[PDB]
Every structure is written in C-alpha cells, then in structure tokens.
Design an enzyme around this catalytic site. Sequence first.
Site: not given
Length: 619
Positions: A322-324
């Site tokens: 995800g956004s990491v």
Amino acid sequence: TKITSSSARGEIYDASGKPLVENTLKQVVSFTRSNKMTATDLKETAKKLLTYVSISSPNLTERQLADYYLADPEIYKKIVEALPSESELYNNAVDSVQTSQLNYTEDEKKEIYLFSQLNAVGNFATGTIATDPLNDSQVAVIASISKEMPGISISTSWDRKVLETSLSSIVGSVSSEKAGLPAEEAEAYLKKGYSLNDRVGTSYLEKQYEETLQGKRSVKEIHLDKYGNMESVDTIEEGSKGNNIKLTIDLAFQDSVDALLKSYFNSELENGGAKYSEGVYAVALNPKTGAVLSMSGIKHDLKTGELTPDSLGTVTNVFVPGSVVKAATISSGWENGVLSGNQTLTDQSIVFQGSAPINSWYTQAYGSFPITAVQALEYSSNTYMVQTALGLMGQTYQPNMFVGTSNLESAMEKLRSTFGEYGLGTATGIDLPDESTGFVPKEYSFANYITNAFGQFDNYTPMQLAQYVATIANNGVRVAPRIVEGIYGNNDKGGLGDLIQQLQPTEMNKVNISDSDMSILHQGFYQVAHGTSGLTTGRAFSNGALVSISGKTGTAESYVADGQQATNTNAVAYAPSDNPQIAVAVVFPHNTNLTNGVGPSIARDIINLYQKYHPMNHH
Ligand SMILES: [Cl-]
Ligand SMILES: [Cl-]
C-alpha cells in the site's frame, strides 16, 4: 587410516550475553568393527570391558541370548546337527530352535548385554555402548589401554538443545549425530571437506554461520595387519569447541516488543477488526549500521482462532504494501527525470478509456488542485503517484485517454528497478540462508503497472520494507541487515569468551538521487507526522511520542474471504527525525476495522519502547 567425529558445537548469545542454546557433554565408549573380529573375538572383549564399567539393568530379550549361545561355532554346528528338514533363513530356524530357558550368572547377564551392544555394530562402522555414566578414572583408564582391548575407545558425545526464548525460532537446528549429513545438500559438503558422519546446521543461523560455529573435529585412526584383523583404535587429536556468536538483538527488548504486539492484536481481536487477519509483523533496525533490533510477529490461525508466535514471518511472508511505498515511486520520478525538484502536479480523478475512475481518498470531495511532491506524500495522493507512472511511460494525462502499451515493458522495469534499489523486491542481503524476495510476477498487465505505482501489486516481505525506510533514513545508502554482531572465543569454563572479530555493516548500494531530492523526501516524511493540514495522514505518529518521528502510513484494500471490503494498515517510520537511530516497519494485513489504522500507532510505540530502552536524544 583415521576416523572423524564432529566436535563440541559453538554457542549463541543474545545482545546481552544471555545464552540461547545448550551443550550437554557426556564421555562414552565407541566400538569399531571389522569383517574380522568375530563372536569369540567379541566375547573376549566383552568380559575384558566389564572389568571397567557399570551395568545393573540387563533386561535382555531371549532372541538376543540365543544369538550369544550360538556364538561358539561348534555350538551352532551341534545345534543345527539336531534340526531336521538360506544361511540366514536357516539361522532363523536354528535361532528359534533352542528352548532358551537356561541359566547365566547374574554378572553373566551383563557382558551378554555388551556383547549384544558390540554385535549391534555394522562392519566398519563405529558405534557406542549403552553403559552406565562414567567418572574420570574409569574413563581415563580406557584412555590408555584401548590397544589392549583391540577396538574399543571412549568418546565425548553431546546433546544440543534450544532454550525457550523469543529468539528460539531464529536459532535454527543442527543435524543429530544419529542423523549425520542430510543427503539433499549432503554431497556438496563432502566436496567442501566434511567427514560423512558430521553434524551441521540444517537451517537458519545454525546453518548460516556454519564455518565459524563448527568445532574442529575430533580424530582417530586405526592400525592392523596384512590380514585386516583389528589391532587397536587411537586418538591423534581430541576435538575442541567452536567459536561463539553474539547477536545484535537484546532479549528483554524483543520480548517487550512482543507483548506490545499481543496487546495491540488482542485489541483488534476483541473489537473484531482482526477476524480475517492472518496476523501482525514488526521489524526494527539500526538504519545507519544495519543492525537488527528486533523481528517480531504473530501468526493467527483463522480456523481455530488460536494465536501462535512467529518471527520468521518477517522474512518469509509477503503482503501488498500500500501507500507506504510512494517514496520509491517519486524517486523513480527523479531518476528518470519526469519530476524536477519538488514537482507540482494537479490532484484530479484519473479516468481511462471506459473504466472506473481512479482516485485518492480526498480526491472526490476536494475536486482537482495542485500539489507538491512533499505534499503528495503528506496527503498520500495516488493520483500524483499515477500521473508519475504515466510519466515514465512517456505520456501525459488527458481525460479518457487510450494508452499505447509499446512503452510498457520498458516502463514497468524502470520503476521496478528503482524499487529494487530500496530493497523492495530485491534481496536484502540479510545474514540468513533464505529470505523470500517478494512476489514480483513477470506476467503483468497494464492495470498491474499503475496499481504497482502505489503498492497494490508487487508483494513484499516485512524485512524488505524496514530496509526501504531504513535506506531513506540513511540518505539513500542501503545497508544489509544483519543479526550477528561479533564472533567471540571461549573462556576457561567454556562459555562466552571474547572478541574474535566484529562484523561491520556492508553498503548494498546508494540510491542515486540528489541530496536535495533526498531531503525533499525527508521533509515529506517529517510532515506526514507533524503536519497541520486537514489532509495530513499520520499525526498518529506524533501523539505521545518521546522523540521526533517521521514516517509514512499505508493502506491497501480488497477481497477478504467471504467478504467484504477490508484493508491493510502497514506503516514505516524512523527516528529521531533529526538524527535517525532507529528504523521500523509494521505490517498488519487484512484488517477489518478500516477506520483508524493501528499500523502507525503500533510503530510509534515500538520506537517509544526502544528509546525508553536506549535514549537516542542527546545532541
Ligand atoms: Cl469503519
Ligand atoms: Cl493512539
């Protein structure tokens, strides 16, 4: 001609010197054989041997005694002589032929035992001797007159067990001595020079530092006539012990990270967020030095609901991140020159030919508007991350655009290539036999490309993640994560001696981007935590922190059994922001709660745990 025998194995110590495994020595009697020594020849040794050694319980079976009465050949002759209407088959008959209920002096019954033990040895094999534990004279008398019981000798055998401690998992295992050398990779070893009967790590650390752990091997060769009959066994050199090994990880801390995990997991299991969660994983580092602070984890069996502890989880399992990962992507922006310094783009819904809009969490309420890379990390804009994917592919967004895929194969590799510079999808260079290196499919679609641009495609190990943020916290210099700190000798008792050689960190590569780009990255991570925008994603980092933290939070969503949309709440972070001494990533998959991700919050408390352990502030 000489026989080899593995030697005392080296031992393993946590950061503090607390030990992780167990050597249990015990000196004993090995018996060689010889197509030559023979029933009679073996009886002779039996009695001679009982003059030294102790044996109360002789629970002999009859099948054994039979074999001993038949030992005199004459006997056997005369016994068969009596049977009426193939060697071993006719032994099989003769064996059972004699009714065995027949006396033996009670001390008798004892070298009949031995004899059983002695006979039990295969030709040319060297076996042991179910005996009665040995003192020091009893033993060292044998040390002197093997050559008077042609064959026998006393060896120092050992049990090796693993202590119950959070790190147990990592230690790995070694081959038993009854086991020898596991064929599988077995051969490869004889080529490296091992005796066949050796004992070697089968996995994880025990295997990883084999060279250094293995204690120099014990030695004996044997003499004999032009006729092969045994003349006596002998010691050229008794074995010593191994070198030792001190870890980067401190028990108490790893231990306390772990309840922290339990605490948080139970919270989510309680309020029901965790019904579909496989578990939660967390890994900590020194970003500058690549030392491991802790690798913790919690498997959760969805069937019986039970919770099992799991640390390997960090290096073995992969998740959608995800956004990491947006930094990686922006950084591919800069290398390939699609972004210039802190680039301004416009945040707007992304729509392709006849297909679902592509949006950021804020995107539809905020209409469209411009936004800097620093901001793009702050508010976690996918659009920006996808407009940037487009860039690599060489095109620029217009509403409703058809995309010519000619530049695709080239585009995905370019991006992927950067991710790999951070450790994402590439080997970490961790000091273990085997890290899984992600789930990077080579068969991939276009949708796949663009979703990969915000970490909803390629699958990564938690250990990879830490490295990726650790690299950022290092200024684009990727250090190989290692679990061992230094090799240490022995002391007079045989415990942790002292320093053979300290393991120094090893640089894997530098992420090629400007410093000013790297700082632009650093600013973002700083504002993900300290920002004052209605859009800021990670003020959770900063709530109750003991030091200034910068990080980046993550969600990816989807499927989830008979379900049901749900998401991951991973989070990476480091600190202090000013002078980064710790780097952490937390992965908390198929979370149900979807509302306030506990991923950041967890990582904060990890960092907090660490600085409460080892204060990092102190200009
Ligand atoms: Cl919710
Ligand atoms: Cl909180």
